[PDB]
Design a protein around this ligand. Structure first.
Ligand SMILES: Cc1cc2nc3c(=O)[nH]c(=O)nc-3n(C[C@H](O)[C@H](O)[C@H](O)COP(=O)(O)OP(=O)(O)OC[C@H]3O[C@@H](n4cnc5c(N)ncnc54)[C@H](O)[C@@H]3O)c2cc1C
Ligand SMILES: C/C=C/CC/C=C/CC/C=C/CCCCCCC(=O)OC[C@H](COP(=O)(O)OCCN)OC(=O)CCCCCCC/C=C/C/C=C/CCC
Ligand code: HEM
Ligand SMILES: O=C(NCc1ccc(Cl)cc1Cl)c1ccccc1C(F)(F)F
Ligand code: SF4
Ligand code: F3S
Ligand code: FES
Lengths: 250, 129, 153, 616
């Protein structure tokens, strides 16, 4: 029988003055699904129901199962199990996050920071909601490709050592890409004010171009490229283009 | 039992309600620009300093390094000199130490260029060993 | 001054402090990669140099000893050329690598070459040239000093 | 409450919404625009909601690709329902589709584009131009392969503007009822273990489906039918629960969805003879036939030995004949989901797929205004004051016996919006927030404590497994009276084994053992009612297919000309919604039946659509 072992970070906040720990669990690979989430679920159901972690989608689209596996921040539901049984796989929560319990981090600063970018379409001329479609060209909307895909899982932010030390002031790669997703949207008028919110020395400029964000992103996105692009804009080295004019027969 | 007490809404960041009074323009963008231009400008200066030597390269190096290092340590201090881990006043002290650090650096290099072999010469003498 | 979110973020931290909650492991657990090790090196080299310039300039002033009589002291320790030329490499590399990697990081700052293939080639490319240059600068002159020890004329 | 101490916390709101998917968030936006102090209770961060897993698109007659008409969409919606759908609601759905999807765009949703600069539409299963006489329709608007992801994120983003106050990772336990009215919700805060009672003038149940009743599904682990369970405990009968959508293409081994949009872009099903077999089971529409007809087609091909792969138990979905530029542009998400889960380069090898449990056209019965209802055969539909429901957890019924593809996101946004429109107009600012009755939510805490400290010998994960396994075997794609009745037997015994429940995690702070048990209780209430309704129904309509009753039993024989026949009485025929009253304590289920609404909202605007033979 093929027995893989996992070293899972544990922490119980209800125990008197408890400390975090590492717990080893053995799993028969032949009575378990191919992905690391499968292992966690099996262990939870067949050994230890106190094992606590987030999951929802089984296909890597929700972002719930973000955690640190084998040293990298990834999604448990699409990371395959390393079948070399002589190795143990270490599973920690998202790095440098405050931990509620086990592999479940507190996520509300991440989310708060996501709100602060005003992630919604803005227009300087009030529009009748139901009435008509806004014009956007295939080229213009393709600038969103590589930006809207983001499932908002936090992997990249929790891989960023700048965001480790200064989460309170540096918005981090996840939010910064999303900010830029509303800046290069050609249907959006507030490009100017969006950049205005992250003018200061920490909001965006505390990105020290480390590149962990782009390496680790499990959706194969590139936030470093988007942060770089925001810097170019903040330094007036580039501008946002004007919307391609809306044709007469539209 | 349900003999409860009335509760408040959770911490939640209202992005609109935080938009009333937030005008201030403090654009760090222009500074971030010159920092990198200055770095790029130093690119040729380093091999220049390999070939040409003397008391004025010693002086150009002294200046540009001092300035570029001032901007550097400032950021390194701003990364690690965190009030969450140091409290507010020790953080301020470290920020101040970035300026003390720049000022001793220059004074130390000026001294060295003026009462000693100087930067380039001093490199020659270790590369003769 | 702070942006509103940065004020909210402080209060958030103070809340988390108050809830006696642990911080998830970071340096101790994160897989070393060419991305964050090289950044770490760029900083280490950058800082190490300044520190040497400070302990140098301020050092030789405050002390009675000067740099000429220092070089004499270590010269008179009669230590082998292989070891001396290593120390010279160790001195050239910080400067070489940092200067090279410096220009790579400005590229990143302009959204240039930020894909993982490029990130990884850049990292290797810069570690390479820096070692080549450091070695060039130590060895070539030492090779001239052998072309003088044993030579016609 | 007997054993432990629970910290109860009271809150007062104009409207509480249980849910944060399409329906939930669209409703919050409407209500917050309309001024109301709104509270959104969701057991997971809204972006993690299942809406985000949606792929294929959202229907609206925008006519970006060719001329279109919302009435043509209405036709297909009704025909899709196999005339179990309430036509007043299917009217409202389609009449509003253009507006709703346009709004979504205006909100910033990054729809894929036509060269003209308009919203790209694709073809999809079960839709046609011209009242079923013209060609294949192209109503299905999309952000490529991730329409649900992009819609939910856009909606969520826009909900940070309505000053709506989110309670995230709160597990809704029950509705707060006071003499047949819904004054609130009671829930549990995962973060800290505290119990929360929400007083509210209104209450919108927007909780999504119950796909995890079965053993294999495309749904999330969070699709446990909590809302329907909530309703059952409130003493509200559920509607049409036997109508379970099996989606034709879910990845063979693992259950992950491959969108119907992959067919509608040119892909097709192939059996082990290398034959495009859908040309037999449906000559006109071939691979784009309705969802229930295709899933039955595959299921037969398996049963008659034509199945594919080592065990000959699934079939192939072929896409590799399409250009690699189309696959990357139209289907990037599944192009990748196939690589990760099936190890398949979709541009060369086909995807191993097989019908998989997917949608729930059943749910909480409502009128066309999304107001929950009880039904007496004398007093008719009687609304439940204070209670609305929408999205998948609801049953309007816009889907009847078979949901049309890309009609769900549409359903959720339309009727989610509809709730706010209706509450704006019926709720007025003199009326004040209801005071809770005494000891409110006390039994909800009693159940919590009991399950938290449950001491039995059957542990929560085994029971769910045998529920899932049972439901899979008996209430399947093809069902029979003896199997059904044997299944009903097994399930009613599993409901008893619920008293022998073991849990282990005794904590209150983020206890995923405790909630997954609460979820199991809920899942049992949905599953039991699903199978008893499925057993009694002696006909074959939509996704419900009885081998021992293969014909759709209407008031007439709509295969023969209508005039010169006599109306069968309500009790003999089966064009009628199934209602399932369940006692949550005993588990006993009574049955009743409710007439299908055939009128439209306005005959002047559009005529109703008399039943015909359903042939794709
Ligand atoms: C894989 C897949 C792909 C699909 N693709 C498409 C498509 O392309 N087009 C289309 O039209 N339809 C599609 N559907 C169908 C459609 O996406 C869903 O039916 C629809 O999104 C449901 O929306 P909803 O808001 O009703 O529920 P959901 O979107 O599932 O949201 C449910 C909400 O209820 C909350 N909730 C549940 N229980 C509790 C509780 N106890 N307490 C508090 N909150 C609770 C959850 O936290 C969540 O926020 C797809 C379905 C699946 C499974
Ligand atoms: C801990 C480490 C501490 C380090 C000290 C920190 C000091 C930093 C400042 C250094 C400034 C540049 C030095 C130039 C120099 O010393 O001349 C050569 C000398 C030899 O004398 P010498 O033997 O007298 O030299 C020959 C005399 N002509 O010293 C060298 O050999 C240094 C080699 C410099 C390498 C150049 C980097 C490569 C740049 C590439 C740029 C690419 C494109 C443009
Ligand atoms: C000659 C060309 C040089 C270039 C192009 C260059 C470039 C850079 C850049 C781009 C940074 C910012 C990195 C960040 O913020 O993440 C930086 C930081 C720094 N540089 Fe240089 N540099 C050069 C020479 C030097 C020299 C000679 C020293 C000598 C002491 C030095 C010391 C530093 C220090 C201390 C930092 C601190 C910030 C950090 O570690 O990230 N640099 N340099
Ligand atoms: O701290 C950094 N990297 C992580 C790290 C911390 C401590 C050590 Cl000893 C080593 C490394 Cl790599 C870092 C490095 C270069 C630039 C910026 C940072 C920082 F501050 F942003 F995180
Ligand atoms: S970018 Fe990649 S990693 Fe960062 S959040 Fe969006 S998805 Fe998760
Ligand atoms: S990991 Fe961090 S500093 Fe910048 S480019 Fe990547 S975000
Ligand atoms: S559980 Fe959905 S991202 Fe893994």
């Amino acid at each position: 029988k093929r027995i893989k072992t996992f070293e899972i970070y544990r922490f119980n906040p209800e125990e008197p003055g408890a400390k975090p720990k590492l717990q080893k669990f053995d799993v028969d690979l032949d009575k378990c699904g191919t992905m690391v989430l499968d292992a966690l679920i099996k262990i939870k159901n067949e050994v230890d129901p106190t094992l606590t972690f987030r999951r929802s989608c089984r296909e890597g689209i929700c972002g719930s199962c973000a955690m640190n596996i084998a040293g990298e921040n990834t999604l448990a539901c699409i990371c395959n199990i390393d079948q070399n049984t002589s190795k143990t796989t270490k599973i920690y929560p998202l790095p440098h996050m405050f931990v509620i319990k086990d592999l479940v981090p507190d996520m509300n600063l991440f989310y708060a920071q996501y709100a602060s970018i005003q992630p919604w379409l803005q227009k300087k001329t009030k529009i009748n909601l139901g009435e008509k479609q806004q014009y956007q060209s295939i080229k213009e909307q393709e600038k969103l490709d590589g930006l809207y895909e983001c499932i908002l899982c936090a992997c990249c932010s929790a891989s960023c050592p700048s965001y480790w030390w200064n989460a309170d002031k540096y918005l981090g790669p996840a939010v910064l890409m999303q900010a830029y997703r509303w800046i290069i949207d050609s249907r959006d008028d507030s490009a100017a004010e969006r950049l205005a919110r992250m003018q200061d020395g920490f909001s965006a400029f505390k990105c020290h171009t480390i590149m962990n964000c782009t390496k680790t992103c499990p959706k194969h996105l590139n936030p470093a490229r988007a942060i770089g692009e925001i810097k170019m804009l903040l330094t007036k080295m580039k501008t946002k283009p004007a919307p391609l004019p809306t044709p007469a027969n539209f | 039992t349900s003999a409860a007490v009335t509760g408040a809404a959770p911490p939640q960041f209202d992005p609109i309600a935080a938009e009333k009074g937030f005008k201030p323009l403090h654009s760090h963008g222009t500074l971030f620009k010159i920092e990198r231009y200055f770095a790029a400008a130093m690119v040729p200066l380093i091999p220049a300093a390999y070939f040409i030597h003397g008391r004025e390269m010693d002086l150009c190096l002294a200046l540009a390094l001092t300035l570029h290092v001032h901007w550097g340590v400032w950021g390194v201090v701003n990364d690690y000199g965190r009030p969450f881990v140091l409290g507010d006043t020790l953080a301020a002290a470290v920020r101040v130490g970035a300026y003390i650090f720049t000022a001793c650096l220059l004074a130390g290099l000026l001294y060295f260029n003026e009462h000693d072999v100087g930067l380039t010469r001093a490199f020659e003498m270790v590369w003769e060993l | 001054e702070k942006t509103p979110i940065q004020v909210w973020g402080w209060d958030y931290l103070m809340r988390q402090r108050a809830l006696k909650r642990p911080i998830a492991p970071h340096l101790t657990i994160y897989k070393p990669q060419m991305t964050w090790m090289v950044s770490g090196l760029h900083r280490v080299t950058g800082c190490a140099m300044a520190g040497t310039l400070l302990i140098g300039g301020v050092g030789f002033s405050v002390l009675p000893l000067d740099f000429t009589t220092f070089v004499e002291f270590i010269r008179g320790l009669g230590i082998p050329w292989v070891i001396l030329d290593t120390f010279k490499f160790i001195i050239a590399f910080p400067i070489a690598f940092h200067t090279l990697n410096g220009i790579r990081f400005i590229g990143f700052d302009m959204a240039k070459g930020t894909d993982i293939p490029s990130i990884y080639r850049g990292a290797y490319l810069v570690l390479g040239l820096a070692a080549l240059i450091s070695l060039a600068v130590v060895v070539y002159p030492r090779w001239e000093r052998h072309k003088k020890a044993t030579l016609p004329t | 409450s007997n054993i432990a101490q629970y910290k109860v916390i009271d809150h007062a709101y104009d409207v509480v919404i249980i849910g944060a998917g399409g329906a939930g968030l669209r409703a919050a936006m409407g209500l917050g625009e309309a001024g109301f102090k709104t509270a959104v209770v969701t057991k997971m961060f809204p972006t993690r909601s299942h809406t985000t897993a949606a792929q294929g698109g959202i229907n609206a007659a925008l006519g970006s690709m060719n001329p279109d008409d919302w009435k043509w969409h209405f036709y297909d919606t009704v025909k899709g329902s196999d005339w179990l759908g309430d036509q007043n609601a299917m009217h409202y759905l389609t009449r509003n589709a253009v507006e709703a999807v346009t709004e979504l765009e205006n909100f910033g949703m990054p729809f894929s584009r036509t060269p003209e600069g308009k919203i790209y539409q694709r073809s999809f299963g079960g839709q046609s131009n011209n009242y079923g006489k013209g060609g294949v329709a192209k109503r299905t608007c999309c952000v490529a392969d991730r329409t649900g992801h992009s819609m939910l994120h856009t909606l969520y983003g826009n909900s940070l503007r309505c000053h709506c106050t989110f309670f995230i990772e709160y597990f809704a336990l029950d509705l707060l009822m006071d003499k047949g009215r819904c004054v609130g919700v009671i829930a549990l805060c995962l973060e800290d273990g505290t119990i929360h009672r929400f007083r509210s003038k209104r209450t919108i149940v927007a909780t999504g489906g119950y796909g995890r009743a079965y053993f294999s599904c495309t749904t999330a682990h969070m699709n446990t039918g909590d809302g329907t369970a909530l309703a059952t405990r409130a003493g509200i009968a559920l509607e049409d629960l036997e109508f379970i959508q099996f989606h034709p293409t879910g990845i063979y081994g693992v259950g992950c969805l491959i969108t119907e949009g992959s067919r509608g872009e040119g892909g097709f099903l192939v059996n082990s003879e290398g034959e495009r077999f859908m040309e037999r089971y449906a000559p006109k529409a071939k691979d784009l036939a309705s969802r229930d007809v295709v899933s039955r087609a595959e299921t037969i091909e398996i049963m008659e030995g034509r199945g594919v792969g080592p065990e000959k138990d699934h079939i192939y979905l072929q896409l590799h004949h399409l250009p690699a530029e189309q696959l990357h542009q139209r289907l990037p998400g599944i192009s990748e989901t196939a690589k990760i889960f099936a190890g398949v380069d979709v541009t060369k090898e086909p995807i191993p797929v097989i019908p998989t449990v997917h949608y729930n056209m059943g749910g909480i019965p409502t009128n066309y205004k999304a107001q929950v209802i009880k039904y007496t055969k004398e007093g008719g539909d009687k609304i439940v004051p204070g209670l609305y429901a929408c999205g998948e957890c609801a049953c309007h019924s816009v889907h009847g016996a078979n949901r049309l593809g890309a009609n769900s996101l549409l359903d959720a946004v339309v009727f989610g919006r509809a709730c706010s429109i209706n509450i704006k107009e019926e709720l007025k600012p003199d009326e004040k927030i209801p005071e809770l009755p005494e000891g409110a939510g006390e039994e909800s805490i009693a159940n919590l404590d009991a399950v938290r400290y449950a001491n039995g010998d059957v542990p929560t994960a085994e029971l769910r497994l045998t529920m899932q396994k049972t439901m899979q075997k008996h209430a399947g794609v093809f069902r029979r009276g003896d199997i059904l009745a044997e299944g009903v037997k097994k399930m009613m015994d599993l409901f008893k084994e619920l008293k022998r429940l073991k849990t282990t995690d005794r904590s209150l702070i983020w206890n995923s053992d405790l909630t997954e048990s609460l979820e199991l209780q809920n899942l049992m209430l949905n599953a039991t009612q699903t199978i008893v309704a499925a057993e009694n129904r002696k006909e074959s309509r939509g996704a419900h297919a009885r081998d021992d009753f293969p014909k759709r039993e209407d008031e007439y024989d709509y295969s023969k000309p209508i005039e010169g026949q006599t109306k069968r009485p309500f009790e003999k025929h089966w064009r009628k919604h199934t209602l399932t009253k369940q006692d949550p304590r005993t588990g006993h289920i009574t049955l009743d039946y409710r007439p299908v609404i055939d009128k439209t909202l306005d005959p002047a605007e559009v005529d109703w659509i008399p039943p015909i033979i359903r042939s794709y």
